[PDB]
Specification:
2 copies of one chain form a homodimer. Chain A is built from 6 helices and 11 strands. Chain A has helices spanning 9-18, 51-64, 122-130, 149-156, 169-179, 197-222; strands at 2-6, 20-27, 30-37, 40-46, 69-72, 75-78, 88-96, 118-119, 134-141, 162-166, 183-192. Bound molecules: adenine (2 copies). One adenine binds at residues 75-77, 146-147, 166-168, 191-192, 194, 198, 202 of chain B. Chain B: One of its GO terms (molecular function) is methylthioadenosine nucleosidase activity.
Chain lengths: 223, 231
Protein backbone atom coordinates (compact mmCIF):
# COMPACT_ATOMS: atom_id res chain seq x y z
CA UNK A 1 0.00 0.00 0.00
CA UNK A 2 2.82 2.55 0.67
CA UNK A 3 6.12 2.47 -1.28
CA UNK A 4 9.46 4.00 -0.30
CA UNK A 5 12.21 4.09 -2.92
CA UNK A 6 15.94 4.60 -2.25
CA UNK A 7 18.83 4.26 -4.67
CA UNK A 8 21.70 3.01 -2.53
CA UNK A 9 22.20 0.46 0.22
CA UNK A 10 22.93 3.18 2.79
CA UNK A 11 19.68 4.99 1.91
CA UNK A 12 17.46 1.92 2.47
CA UNK A 13 19.25 -0.23 5.09
CA UNK A 14 18.01 2.05 7.89
CA UNK A 15 14.37 1.62 6.92
CA UNK A 16 14.82 -2.07 6.11
CA UNK A 17 15.87 -2.88 9.68
CA UNK A 18 12.73 -1.15 11.06
CA UNK A 19 10.48 -3.30 8.86
CA UNK A 20 8.80 -6.26 10.52
CA UNK A 21 7.59 -9.42 8.83
CA UNK A 22 10.21 -8.58 6.20
CA UNK A 23 10.00 -10.62 3.01
CA UNK A 24 12.57 -9.64 0.36
CA UNK A 25 12.42 -10.57 -3.32
CA UNK A 26 14.65 -9.59 -6.29
CA UNK A 27 13.32 -8.67 -9.74
CA UNK A 28 15.69 -7.64 -12.55
CA UNK A 29 18.47 -7.21 -9.96
CA UNK A 30 16.29 -4.84 -7.92
CA UNK A 31 15.64 -5.54 -4.24
CA UNK A 32 12.02 -5.35 -3.04
CA UNK A 33 11.64 -5.70 0.72
CA UNK A 34 8.05 -5.90 1.95
CA UNK A 35 7.04 -5.55 5.61
CA UNK A 36 5.22 -3.58 8.31
CA UNK A 37 6.12 -0.14 9.67
CA UNK A 38 3.99 2.45 11.51
CA UNK A 39 1.00 0.17 10.83
CA UNK A 40 1.52 0.47 7.06
CA UNK A 41 2.28 -2.21 4.53
CA UNK A 42 5.51 -0.74 3.23
CA UNK A 43 7.21 -1.82 -0.01
CA UNK A 44 10.86 -0.85 0.26
CA UNK A 45 12.74 -0.70 -3.03
CA UNK A 46 16.44 -0.25 -3.73
CA UNK A 47 16.23 1.26 -7.20
CA UNK A 48 19.88 1.71 -8.01
CA UNK A 49 21.32 4.99 -9.23
CA UNK A 50 20.16 7.02 -12.26
CA UNK A 51 17.05 7.73 -14.32
CA UNK A 52 16.76 4.42 -16.14
CA UNK A 53 17.31 2.39 -12.95
CA UNK A 54 14.73 4.43 -11.07
CA UNK A 55 12.25 4.36 -13.96
CA UNK A 56 12.58 0.59 -14.47
CA UNK A 57 12.46 -0.19 -10.77
CA UNK A 58 9.51 2.18 -10.16
CA UNK A 59 7.65 0.53 -13.06
CA UNK A 60 8.23 -2.96 -11.65
CA UNK A 61 6.94 -1.71 -8.28
CA UNK A 62 3.77 -0.24 -9.79
CA UNK A 63 3.14 -3.31 -11.96
CA UNK A 64 3.74 -6.00 -9.33
CA UNK A 65 2.94 -4.32 -6.01
CA UNK A 66 0.38 -1.61 -6.86
CA UNK A 67 1.17 0.79 -3.99
CA UNK A 68 -1.31 3.61 -3.34
CA UNK A 69 1.42 6.19 -2.69
CA UNK A 70 5.16 6.47 -3.33
CA UNK A 71 7.91 8.24 -1.42
CA UNK A 72 11.40 8.77 -2.76
CA UNK A 73 14.23 9.04 -0.23
CA UNK A 74 18.03 9.31 -0.06
CA UNK A 75 20.78 11.88 -0.45
CA UNK A 76 20.80 14.98 -2.69
CA UNK A 77 23.05 17.89 -3.61
CA UNK A 78 22.21 21.26 -2.09
CA UNK A 79 21.42 23.97 -4.62
CA UNK A 80 19.73 26.84 -2.69
CA UNK A 81 22.15 29.07 -0.74
CA UNK A 82 20.24 28.90 2.57
CA UNK A 83 20.62 25.12 2.89
CA UNK A 84 23.33 23.12 4.64
CA UNK A 85 24.50 19.52 4.68
CA UNK A 86 22.05 17.54 6.84
CA UNK A 87 18.96 19.52 5.82
CA UNK A 88 15.84 17.73 4.58
CA UNK A 89 13.91 18.82 1.47
CA UNK A 90 10.30 17.93 0.64
CA UNK A 91 9.50 18.09 -3.07
CA UNK A 92 6.92 20.68 -4.02
CA UNK A 93 7.63 19.86 -7.65
CA UNK A 94 10.13 17.74 -9.60
CA UNK A 95 11.89 18.50 -12.91
CA UNK A 96 14.66 17.16 -15.13
CA UNK A 97 17.62 19.56 -15.18
CA UNK A 98 19.40 17.77 -18.05
CA UNK A 99 16.49 17.49 -20.49
CA UNK A 100 16.75 19.78 -23.52
CA UNK A 101 14.31 19.55 -26.38
CA UNK A 102 14.09 23.34 -26.71
CA UNK A 103 14.69 22.96 -30.46
CA UNK A 104 10.99 22.02 -30.60
CA UNK A 105 9.88 24.75 -28.17
CA UNK A 106 9.46 22.64 -25.07
CA UNK A 107 10.74 24.70 -22.16
CA UNK A 108 14.04 23.66 -20.65
CA UNK A 109 13.86 20.41 -18.68
CA UNK A 110 10.51 19.43 -20.19
CA UNK A 111 10.26 15.92 -21.62
CA UNK A 112 8.01 15.94 -24.72
CA UNK A 113 4.41 14.93 -23.98
CA UNK A 114 5.04 15.65 -20.29
CA UNK A 115 4.17 18.74 -18.28
CA UNK A 116 7.21 21.00 -17.63
CA UNK A 117 7.34 19.62 -14.07
CA UNK A 118 5.70 17.03 -11.83
CA UNK A 119 3.75 18.31 -8.83
CA UNK A 120 4.04 16.25 -5.67
CA UNK A 121 0.89 15.10 -3.87
CA UNK A 122 -0.84 17.94 -2.01
CA UNK A 123 -1.98 15.67 0.83
CA UNK A 124 1.51 14.21 1.35
CA UNK A 125 3.15 17.64 1.18
CA UNK A 126 0.58 19.06 3.64
CA UNK A 127 1.24 16.14 5.95
CA UNK A 128 5.02 16.48 5.69
CA UNK A 129 4.66 20.22 6.40
CA UNK A 130 3.07 19.55 9.80
CA UNK A 131 6.02 17.34 10.82
CA UNK A 132 8.63 20.01 9.84
CA UNK A 133 16.09 21.89 9.48
CA UNK A 134 13.36 20.76 7.04
CA UNK A 135 12.25 22.76 3.97
CA UNK A 136 9.84 22.48 1.07
CA UNK A 137 10.93 23.21 -2.51
CA UNK A 138 11.75 22.11 -6.04
CA UNK A 139 14.05 19.17 -6.75
CA UNK A 140 15.57 18.58 -10.21
CA UNK A 141 17.19 15.40 -11.51
CA UNK A 142 19.83 14.56 -14.10
CA UNK A 143 21.90 11.50 -14.99
CA UNK A 144 25.05 13.08 -13.54
CA UNK A 145 26.63 13.79 -10.17
CA UNK A 146 26.86 17.60 -9.98
CA UNK A 147 30.43 18.06 -8.73
CA UNK A 148 31.51 20.42 -11.54
CA UNK A 149 30.90 24.09 -10.60
CA UNK A 150 30.35 25.01 -14.26
CA UNK A 151 27.64 22.43 -14.64
CA UNK A 152 26.00 23.79 -11.48
CA UNK A 153 26.19 27.40 -12.75
CA UNK A 154 24.62 26.32 -16.07
CA UNK A 155 21.62 24.91 -14.15
CA UNK A 156 21.15 27.97 -11.85
CA UNK A 157 19.93 30.14 -14.69
CA UNK A 158 17.42 27.58 -16.01
CA UNK A 159 15.06 27.26 -12.99
CA UNK A 160 13.32 29.69 -10.64
CA UNK A 161 14.69 28.64 -7.25
CA UNK A 162 15.93 25.09 -7.28
CA UNK A 163 16.56 23.63 -3.82
CA UNK A 164 18.30 20.29 -4.40
CA UNK A 165 19.62 18.11 -7.19
CA UNK A 166 19.97 14.34 -7.60
CA UNK A 167 19.50 11.44 -10.06
CA UNK A 168 16.12 9.64 -9.57
CA UNK A 169 13.23 11.87 -8.42
CA UNK A 170 12.02 12.94 -11.87
CA UNK A 171 12.12 9.38 -13.20
CA UNK A 172 10.05 8.30 -10.21
CA UNK A 173 7.63 11.21 -10.64
CA UNK A 174 7.32 10.81 -14.40
CA UNK A 175 6.46 7.11 -14.03
CA UNK A 176 4.00 7.87 -11.20
CA UNK A 177 2.59 10.68 -13.32
CA UNK A 178 1.68 8.24 -16.07
CA UNK A 179 0.41 5.59 -13.65
CA UNK A 180 -1.44 8.41 -11.80
CA UNK A 181 0.06 7.46 -8.44
CA UNK A 182 0.63 10.21 -5.86
CA UNK A 183 4.29 10.76 -5.00
CA UNK A 184 6.59 12.88 -2.88
CA UNK A 185 10.36 13.18 -2.64
CA UNK A 186 11.90 13.42 0.83
CA UNK A 187 15.68 13.60 0.74
CA UNK A 188 18.45 15.00 2.93
CA UNK A 189 21.58 16.85 1.84
CA UNK A 190 24.83 14.90 1.70
CA UNK A 191 26.71 17.87 0.23
CA UNK A 192 26.45 21.18 -1.61
CA UNK A 193 26.36 20.71 -5.38
CA UNK A 194 29.56 22.00 -7.00
CA UNK A 195 31.43 22.56 -3.71
CA UNK A 196 33.81 19.74 -2.69
CA UNK A 197 30.68 17.59 -3.42
CA UNK A 198 32.08 14.05 -3.59
CA UNK A 199 34.34 14.46 -0.53
CA UNK A 200 31.40 15.88 1.42
CA UNK A 201 29.13 13.12 0.06
CA UNK A 202 31.34 10.25 1.30
CA UNK A 203 31.52 12.05 4.63
CA UNK A 204 27.79 12.75 5.20
CA UNK A 205 25.89 10.09 3.17
CA UNK A 206 25.04 8.04 6.27
CA UNK A 207 23.81 11.23 7.99
CA UNK A 208 21.66 12.07 4.96
CA UNK A 209 20.17 8.57 4.94
CA UNK A 210 19.46 8.86 8.67
CA UNK A 211 17.79 12.29 8.59
CA UNK A 212 15.77 11.42 5.53
CA UNK A 213 14.69 8.06 6.98
CA UNK A 214 13.67 9.54 10.35
CA UNK A 215 11.47 12.26 8.80
CA UNK A 216 9.83 9.64 6.61
CA UNK A 217 9.14 7.46 9.65
CA UNK A 218 7.32 10.35 11.33
CA UNK A 219 5.37 11.12 8.17
CA UNK A 220 4.36 7.44 8.04
CA UNK A 221 3.56 7.48 11.76
CA UNK A 222 1.40 10.55 11.09
CA UNK A 223 -0.25 9.11 7.91
CA UNK B 1 7.86 -13.39 -29.17
CA UNK B 2 9.63 -10.39 -30.84
CA UNK B 3 9.28 -6.80 -29.70
CA UNK B 4 9.89 -3.67 -31.74
CA UNK B 5 9.88 -0.32 -30.00
CA UNK B 6 9.61 3.19 -31.31
CA UNK B 7 9.09 6.55 -29.79
CA UNK B 8 6.89 8.57 -32.09
CA UNK B 9 3.91 7.75 -34.16
CA UNK B 10 5.71 8.21 -37.39
CA UNK B 11 8.25 5.64 -36.32
CA UNK B 12 5.63 2.92 -35.54
CA UNK B 13 2.65 3.65 -37.83
CA UNK B 14 4.46 2.03 -40.78
CA UNK B 15 5.00 -1.23 -38.88
CA UNK B 16 1.54 -1.09 -37.32
CA UNK B 17 -0.21 -1.17 -40.71
CA UNK B 18 1.79 -4.28 -41.74
CA UNK B 19 0.67 -6.13 -38.59
CA UNK B 20 -2.19 -8.60 -39.00
CA UNK B 21 -4.57 -9.79 -36.31
CA UNK B 22 -3.77 -6.43 -34.67
CA UNK B 23 -4.98 -6.05 -31.08
CA UNK B 24 -3.97 -2.75 -29.41
CA UNK B 25 -4.00 -2.07 -25.68
CA UNK B 26 -2.83 0.94 -23.61
CA UNK B 27 -0.89 0.71 -20.33
CA UNK B 28 0.22 3.86 -18.48
CA UNK B 29 -0.51 5.90 -21.62
CA UNK B 30 1.73 3.61 -23.71
CA UNK B 31 0.36 1.94 -26.84
CA UNK B 32 1.01 -1.82 -27.23
CA UNK B 33 -0.09 -3.21 -30.59
CA UNK B 34 0.16 -6.99 -30.91
CA UNK B 35 -0.10 -8.90 -34.20
CA UNK B 36 1.57 -11.06 -36.85
CA UNK B 37 4.39 -10.07 -39.23
CA UNK B 38 6.88 -12.21 -41.20
CA UNK B 39 5.44 -15.22 -39.32
CA UNK B 40 6.46 -13.70 -35.97
CA UNK B 41 4.32 -12.67 -33.03
CA UNK B 42 5.31 -9.03 -32.90
CA UNK B 43 4.66 -6.72 -29.96
CA UNK B 44 4.79 -3.16 -31.28
CA UNK B 45 5.30 -0.47 -28.65
CA UNK B 46 5.15 3.30 -28.93
CA UNK B 47 7.41 4.24 -26.03
CA UNK B 48 7.29 8.00 -26.22
CA UNK B 49 10.39 10.16 -26.28
CA UNK B 50 13.23 10.14 -23.69
CA UNK B 51 15.00 7.82 -21.26
CA UNK B 52 12.30 7.55 -18.61
CA UNK B 53 9.54 6.96 -21.19
CA UNK B 54 11.59 4.29 -22.92
CA UNK B 55 12.68 2.68 -19.63
CA UNK B 56 9.13 2.59 -18.23
CA UNK B 57 7.58 1.38 -21.48
CA UNK B 58 10.30 -1.27 -22.03
CA UNK B 59 9.76 -2.50 -18.46
CA UNK B 60 6.01 -2.82 -18.98
CA UNK B 61 6.70 -4.77 -22.19
CA UNK B 62 9.07 -7.19 -20.48
CA UNK B 63 6.78 -7.66 -17.46
CA UNK B 64 3.50 -8.15 -19.34
CA UNK B 65 4.52 -9.56 -22.75
CA UNK B 66 7.80 -11.39 -22.12
CA UNK B 67 9.29 -11.05 -25.63
CA UNK B 68 12.35 -13.17 -26.44
CA UNK B 69 14.10 -10.38 -28.34
CA UNK B 70 13.76 -6.61 -28.63
CA UNK B 71 14.47 -4.25 -31.50
CA UNK B 72 14.56 -0.49 -31.14
CA UNK B 73 13.69 1.57 -34.22
CA UNK B 74 13.14 5.20 -35.27
CA UNK B 75 15.12 8.29 -36.18
CA UNK B 76 18.56 9.35 -34.90
CA UNK B 77 21.08 12.17 -35.30
CA UNK B 78 24.12 11.46 -37.41
CA UNK B 79 27.43 11.78 -35.59
CA UNK B 80 30.09 10.08 -37.78
CA UNK B 81 31.26 12.22 -40.71
CA UNK B 82 30.78 9.52 -43.38
CA UNK B 83 27.03 9.20 -42.75
CA UNK B 84 24.17 11.03 -44.45
CA UNK B 85 20.50 11.60 -43.82
CA UNK B 86 18.65 8.41 -44.82
CA UNK B 87 21.39 6.01 -43.68
CA UNK B 88 20.59 3.11 -41.37
CA UNK B 89 22.72 2.24 -38.32
CA UNK B 90 22.78 -1.11 -36.50
CA UNK B 91 23.92 -0.87 -32.89
CA UNK B 92 27.12 -2.71 -32.13
CA UNK B 93 27.01 -1.21 -28.66
CA UNK B 94 24.91 1.38 -26.81
CA UNK B 95 26.00 4.03 -24.30
CA UNK B 96 24.65 7.08 -22.47
CA UNK B 97 26.36 10.25 -23.72
CA UNK B 98 24.94 12.48 -20.96
CA UNK B 99 25.81 10.30 -17.95
CA UNK B 100 28.63 11.66 -15.77
CA UNK B 101 29.54 10.05 -12.47
CA UNK B 102 33.28 10.44 -13.12
CA UNK B 103 33.65 11.97 -9.65
CA UNK B 104 33.52 8.34 -8.45
CA UNK B 105 35.78 7.01 -11.21
CA UNK B 106 33.15 5.50 -13.45
CA UNK B 107 34.20 6.22 -17.01
CA UNK B 108 32.21 8.84 -18.88
CA UNK B 109 28.71 7.70 -19.82
CA UNK B 110 28.79 4.77 -17.39
CA UNK B 111 25.80 4.44 -15.07
CA UNK B 112 26.95 3.11 -11.66
CA UNK B 113 26.56 -0.67 -11.31
CA UNK B 114 26.31 -0.96 -15.11
CA UNK B 115 28.98 -1.88 -17.62
CA UNK B 116 30.37 1.18 -19.49
CA UNK B 117 28.23 0.17 -22.49
CA UNK B 118 25.61 -2.36 -23.55
CA UNK B 119 26.59 -4.82 -26.29
CA UNK B 120 23.83 -5.67 -28.75
CA UNK B 121 22.98 -9.32 -29.44
CA UNK B 122 25.64 -11.05 -31.55
CA UNK B 123 23.09 -13.21 -33.39
CA UNK B 124 20.88 -10.23 -34.26
CA UNK B 125 23.85 -8.13 -35.35
CA UNK B 126 25.20 -11.03 -37.48
CA UNK B 127 21.78 -11.45 -39.03
CA UNK B 128 21.39 -7.71 -39.69
CA UNK B 129 24.87 -7.69 -41.25
CA UNK B 130 23.79 -10.16 -43.89
CA UNK B 131 20.87 -7.99 -44.94
CA UNK B 132 23.07 -4.85 -45.33
CA UNK B 133 22.97 -5.62 -49.09
CA UNK B 134 23.41 2.67 -47.13
CA UNK B 135 23.44 0.51 -43.95
CA UNK B 136 26.26 0.57 -41.36
CA UNK B 137 27.13 -1.01 -38.01
CA UNK B 138 28.40 1.08 -35.09
CA UNK B 139 27.96 2.63 -31.67
CA UNK B 140 24.84 4.58 -30.73
CA UNK B 141 24.73 6.84 -27.66
CA UNK B 142 21.69 8.24 -25.90
CA UNK B 143 20.91 11.38 -23.91
CA UNK B 144 17.77 13.16 -22.70
CA UNK B 145 18.31 15.98 -25.18
CA UNK B 146 17.83 16.71 -28.87
CA UNK B 147 21.38 17.46 -30.06
CA UNK B 148 20.79 20.60 -32.16
CA UNK B 149 23.40 22.71 -30.31
CA UNK B 150 26.86 22.44 -31.97
CA UNK B 151 28.57 22.97 -28.61
CA UNK B 152 26.70 20.04 -27.04
CA UNK B 153 27.77 17.93 -30.04
CA UNK B 154 31.44 19.00 -29.80
CA UNK B 155 31.47 18.16 -26.07
CA UNK B 156 30.39 14.58 -26.91
CA UNK B 157 32.89 14.02 -29.77
CA UNK B 158 35.83 13.88 -27.42
CA UNK B 159 34.22 11.39 -24.98
CA UNK B 160 33.73 8.32 -27.23
CA UNK B 161 35.86 6.37 -29.69
CA UNK B 162 33.88 6.66 -32.91
CA UNK B 163 30.24 7.37 -32.21
CA UNK B 164 27.93 6.85 -35.21
CA UNK B 165 24.53 8.20 -34.15
CA UNK B 166 22.78 9.89 -31.21
CA UNK B 167 19.22 9.75 -29.95
CA UNK B 168 17.08 9.55 -26.78
CA UNK B 169 15.95 5.94 -26.03
CA UNK B 170 18.41 3.20 -27.05
CA UNK B 171 20.44 3.11 -23.84
CA UNK B 172 17.32 3.06 -21.65
CA UNK B 173 16.03 0.14 -23.72
CA UNK B 174 19.40 -1.64 -23.56
CA UNK B 175 19.93 -1.01 -19.86
CA UNK B 176 16.49 -2.47 -19.05
CA UNK B 177 17.09 -5.44 -21.36
CA UNK B 178 20.52 -5.82 -19.80
CA UNK B 179 18.98 -6.32 -16.37
CA UNK B 180 16.18 -8.53 -17.65
CA UNK B 181 18.82 -10.41 -19.73
CA UNK B 182 16.86 -10.00 -22.96
CA UNK B 183 18.79 -9.74 -26.25
CA UNK B 184 18.40 -6.39 -28.00
CA UNK B 185 19.49 -4.46 -31.05
CA UNK B 186 18.95 -0.88 -32.19
CA UNK B 187 18.12 -0.29 -35.84
CA UNK B 188 17.55 3.37 -36.63
CA UNK B 189 17.82 5.63 -39.67
CA UNK B 190 19.19 9.18 -39.82
CA UNK B 191 16.67 12.03 -39.88
CA UNK B 192 19.43 14.65 -39.68
CA UNK B 193 23.04 15.38 -38.76
CA UNK B 194 23.46 16.23 -35.08
CA UNK B 195 24.37 19.89 -34.56
CA UNK B 196 23.95 20.99 -38.14
CA UNK B 197 20.48 22.14 -39.16
CA UNK B 198 19.14 19.35 -37.07
CA UNK B 199 15.52 20.24 -36.32
CA UNK B 200 14.78 21.63 -39.81
CA UNK B 201 16.33 18.52 -41.35
CA UNK B 202 14.46 16.31 -38.84
CA UNK B 203 11.00 17.67 -39.75
CA UNK B 204 11.95 17.22 -43.39
CA UNK B 205 13.25 13.61 -43.27
CA UNK B 206 11.56 11.97 -40.23
CA UNK B 207 9.11 10.02 -42.40
CA UNK B 208 12.00 8.86 -44.60
CA UNK B 209 13.91 7.74 -41.50
CA UNK B 210 10.90 5.82 -40.22
CA UNK B 211 10.49 4.18 -43.63
CA UNK B 212 14.12 3.11 -44.10
CA UNK B 213 14.38 1.86 -40.50
CA UNK B 214 11.08 -0.04 -40.77
CA UNK B 215 11.95 -1.69 -44.11
CA UNK B 216 15.32 -2.98 -42.90
CA UNK B 217 13.64 -4.36 -39.79
CA UNK B 218 11.04 -6.12 -41.91
CA UNK B 219 13.75 -7.90 -43.89
CA UNK B 220 15.64 -8.79 -40.70
CA UNK B 221 12.36 -10.26 -39.34
CA UNK B 222 11.70 -11.93 -42.67
CA UNK B 223 15.18 -13.45 -42.51
CA UNK B 224 13.59 -15.91 -40.11
CA UNK B 225 12.71 -18.03 -42.38
CA UNK B 226 16.05 -19.04 -40.92
CA UNK B 227 14.75 -20.98 -38.00
CA UNK B 228 13.37 -23.17 -40.84
CA UNK B 229 14.35 -22.05 -44.41
CA UNK B 230 11.84 -24.63 -45.71
CA UNK B 231 8.65 -22.85 -46.95
N1 LIG C 1 23.71 13.66 -3.31
C1 LIG C 1 23.76 14.00 -4.62
N2 LIG C 1 23.04 13.38 -5.56
C2 LIG C 1 23.11 13.73 -6.86
N3 LIG C 1 23.87 14.73 -7.34
C3 LIG C 1 24.65 15.44 -6.49
N4 LIG C 1 25.51 16.46 -6.61
C4 LIG C 1 26.01 16.76 -5.38
N5 LIG C 1 25.47 15.94 -4.45
C5 LIG C 1 24.63 15.10 -5.06
N1 LIG D 1 16.94 12.21 -34.49
C1 LIG D 1 17.54 12.65 -33.37
N2 LIG D 1 17.32 12.13 -32.15
C2 LIG D 1 17.94 12.61 -31.04
N3 LIG D 1 18.82 13.62 -31.04
C3 LIG D 1 19.13 14.23 -32.21
N4 LIG D 1 19.93 15.23 -32.59
C4 LIG D 1 19.83 15.41 -33.93
N5 LIG D 1 18.96 14.52 -34.44
C5 LIG D 1 18.49 13.76 -33.45
Amino acid sequence: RIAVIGAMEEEVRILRDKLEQAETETVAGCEFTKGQLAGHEVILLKSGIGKVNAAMSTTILLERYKPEKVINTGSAGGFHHSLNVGDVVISTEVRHHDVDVTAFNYEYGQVPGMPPGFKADEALVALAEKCMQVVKGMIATGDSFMSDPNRVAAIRDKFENLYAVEMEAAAVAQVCHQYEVPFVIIRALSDIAGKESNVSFDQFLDQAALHSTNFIVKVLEEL
